[PDB]
Write a protein that binds this ligand. Structure first.
Ligand SMILES: *[C@@H]1O[C@H](CO)[C@@H](O[C@@H]2O[C@H](CO)[C@@H](O)[C@H](O)[C@H]2NC(C)=O)[C@H](O)[C@H]1NC(C)=O
Ligand SMILES: *[C@@H]1O[C@H](CO)[C@@H](O[C@@H]2O[C@H](CO)[C@@H](O)[C@H](O)[C@H]2NC(C)=O)[C@H](O)[C@H]1NC(C)=O
Ligand SMILES: *[C@@H]1O[C@H](CO)[C@@H](O)[C@H](O)[C@H]1NC(C)=O
Ligand SMILES: [Mg+2]
Ligand SMILES: [Mg+2]
Ligand SMILES: [Mg+2]
Ligand SMILES: [Mg+2]
Ligand SMILES: [Mg+2]
Ligand SMILES: [Mg+2]
Length: 550
């Protein structure tokens, strides 16, 4: 281009090299320059597999798109697939390259443009300005195709970190990861269903087990301890993702109950509806309010109460997910702003209860706690993020018509349930309100209560506050009235929010009741921590406990 002489040489290249095959020498006789000829030839070699038809080759040679592995690529894309700015090939900050002009002279390693000097299978790539990610591939258009090499993400990490190749090696608590190849680390990976596509390099954070929470690593302490690492995952609100019951856990460690979860002895098992199942459609009475009321006996047999031993005192709700594991909120156990830090032997639980106030010797059962597991991502300094805990009973509990576990949903189930046209349900003894407010007037209920609440669209729930709602929370409740406090502070603190599957007829815990502005302020919705990402954390906790035995 530009010079006349050059424009002639361009036409000759077209005639002899593009419309026809040419030799290096033929090419040189046309360009009359070793450099120019080497430059051309490297492209011509990169386009070996795309020599016909002519336009296919012309496109490949222009270099604005990747053909095959994209050694042909010569375009000006600056950024990684995840949006990280590419490091200059000539720089050594933050990474010091191993591939340069000298090692790969025909690769056109200029500025910080994505290239594929090493014929890497992920296509053109660059060293990144993120000191925790050495190299990453870029999203390049494919030649002759409405398509790109790898999907773009908007400055965030996809697939819950399963593509992550970086070198972050501390957990969110600043705990150093251990090496995956370390003896104790190998002993715990022994027979896990680790995806071999995830490379377990050094002690870098990885997600080899498909954990919905994201990347993690083992850390020093008790054998099997681990923690999650801070990556900026893409906002994936499960609300908006487009039969039978299959068990996830191992009964030897989870305990009994999963197979039969979510089917109540006194209702589903007798083919009887409870009094408010009939009002569970969002369309019920045009969607208008229906106030809470006394529960029927045994209509929420996974309900659990957490008590201080001395002074005897009701602390929190909780939920039964097997015969030995119980799910609640971490703030129930550890909340430094109230100087709260309860140990196992401070507490007990009561299961199968109906009356708050009475010892119900025919139905209720008392269990002690063996261990408490606070979620490793729990953070109270922020906004009660991952306000979740798991408790292990000292002895398993006996199931009965009043004591039965609830199901836990995975991601598919959760998206499915938030999107069928049914409300959710909160039951308890008003412990949230009692704990978090002065609760004047209306006393605490003496009998288990129930109310049903419709799920609220995430953008509407977002506009109901100036608080940032992470994708791990959701709102539920009826159209508020800014004149009235409404019923946005229902249930027990740490207690269950549940929904019934219209597909397999079982009850699933979708949420854990957390504190929300509803407790203090008009015009709000109730606020619930998602549980759908927890399964692989739980699975790892129940192995950590397997080790606890010696
Ligand atoms: C690209 O890498 C080469 C290979 O390591 C670098 O060349 C070496 O540089 C050291 C000095 O730092 C010399 O002592 C060696 O003799 C060189 N080895 C060879 C085989 O040349 C080179 O300097 C790097 N180039 C850039 C642009 O960073
Ligand atoms: C909550 O309190 C318990 C009990 O006081 C603390 O347990 C201590 O743990 C540290 C570190 O492992 C030990 O030095 C102490 O010996 C433990 N105390 C007892 C009585 O066993 C625990 O550290 C507290 N948790 C938090 C997050 O502050
Ligand atoms: C690429 O990088 C340049 C220089 O760093 C930047 O200013 C520009 O916006 C980017 N160009 C493109 C085409 O994305
Ligand atoms: Mg032509
Ligand atoms: Mg010729
Ligand atoms: Mg010809
Ligand atoms: Mg000649
Ligand atoms: Mg000739
Ligand atoms: Mg000539």
């Amino acid at each position: 281009a530009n010079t006349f002489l050059e424009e002639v040489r361009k036409g000759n290249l077209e005639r002899e090299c593009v419309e026809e095959t040419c030799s290096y020498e033929e090419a040189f006789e046309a360009l009359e320059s070793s450099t120019a000829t080497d430059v051309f030839w490297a492209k011509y070699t990169a386009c070996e597999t795309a020599r016909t038809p002519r336009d296919k080759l012309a496109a490949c040679l222009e270099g604005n798109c990747a053909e095959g592995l994209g050694t042909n690529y010569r375009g000006h894309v600056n950024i990684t697939r995840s949006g990280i700015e590419c490091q200059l090939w000539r720089s050594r900050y933050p990474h010091k390259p191993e591939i340069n002009s000298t090692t790969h002279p025909g690769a056109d390693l200029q500025e910080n443009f994505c290239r594929n000097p090493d014929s890497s299978t992920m296509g053109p790539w660059c060293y990144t300005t993120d000191p925790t990610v050495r190299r990453q591939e870029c999203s390049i258009p494919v030649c002759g195709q409405d398509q790109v090499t790898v999907a773009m993400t908007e400055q965030c990490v996809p697939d819950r970190g399963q593509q992550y190749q970086g070198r972050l090696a501390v957990t969110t608590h600043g705990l150093p990861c251990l090496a995956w190849a370390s003896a104790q680390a190998k002993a715990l990976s022994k027979h896990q269903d680790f995806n071999s596509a995830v490379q377990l390099v050094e002690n870098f954070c990885r997600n080899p087990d498909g954990d919905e929470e994201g990347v993690w690593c083992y850390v020093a302490g008790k054998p099997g301890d681990f923690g999650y690492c801070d990556l900026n995952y893409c906002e994936e609100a499960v609300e908006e993702e487009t039969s039978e019951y299959q068990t996830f856990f191992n009964p030897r460690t989870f305990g009994s109950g999963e197979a039969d979860c979510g089917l109540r002895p006194l209702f589903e098992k007798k083919s009887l509806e409870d009094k408010t199942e009939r009002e569970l459609l969002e369309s019920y009475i045009d969607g208008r309010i229906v106030e809470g009321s006394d529960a029927e006996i045994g209509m929420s047999p996974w309900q659990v109460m957490l008590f201080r031993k001395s002074p005897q005192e009701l602390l929190c709700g909780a939920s039964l997910i097997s015969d030995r594991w119980v799910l609640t909120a971490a703030h129930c156990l550890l909340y430094p702003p109230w100087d709260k830090n309860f140990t196992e032997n401070d507490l007990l639980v009561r299961i199968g209860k109906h009356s708050r106030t009475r010892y119900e010797r025919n139905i209720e059962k008392i269990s002690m706690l063996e261990k408490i597991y606070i979620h490793p991502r729990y953070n109270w300094r922020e906004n009660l993020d991952r306000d979740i805990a798991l408790m292990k009973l000292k002895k398993p509990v006996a199931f009965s018509d009043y004591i039965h576990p609830v199901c836990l949903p995975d991601r598919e189930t959760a998206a499915s349930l938030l999107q069928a046209g049914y409300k959710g349900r909160v039951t308890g003894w008003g412990n949230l309100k009692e704990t978090w407010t002065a609760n004047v007037g209306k006393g605490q209920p003496s009998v288990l209560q129930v109310v049903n609440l419709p799920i609220v669209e995430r953008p509407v729930c977002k506009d109901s506050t100036r608080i940032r709602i992470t994708d791990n929370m959701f709102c539920a409740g009826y159209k508020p009235d800014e004149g009235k406090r409404g019923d946005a502070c229902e249930g027990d603190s740490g207690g269950p929010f549940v929904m019934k599957s219209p597909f397999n007829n079982r009850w699933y815990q979708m949420g854990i009741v957390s504190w929300g502005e509803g407790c203090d302020r008009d015009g709000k919705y109730g606020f619930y921590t998602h549980v759908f990402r927890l399964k692989k954390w739980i699975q790892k906790v129940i192995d950590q406990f397997g080790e606890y035995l010696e």
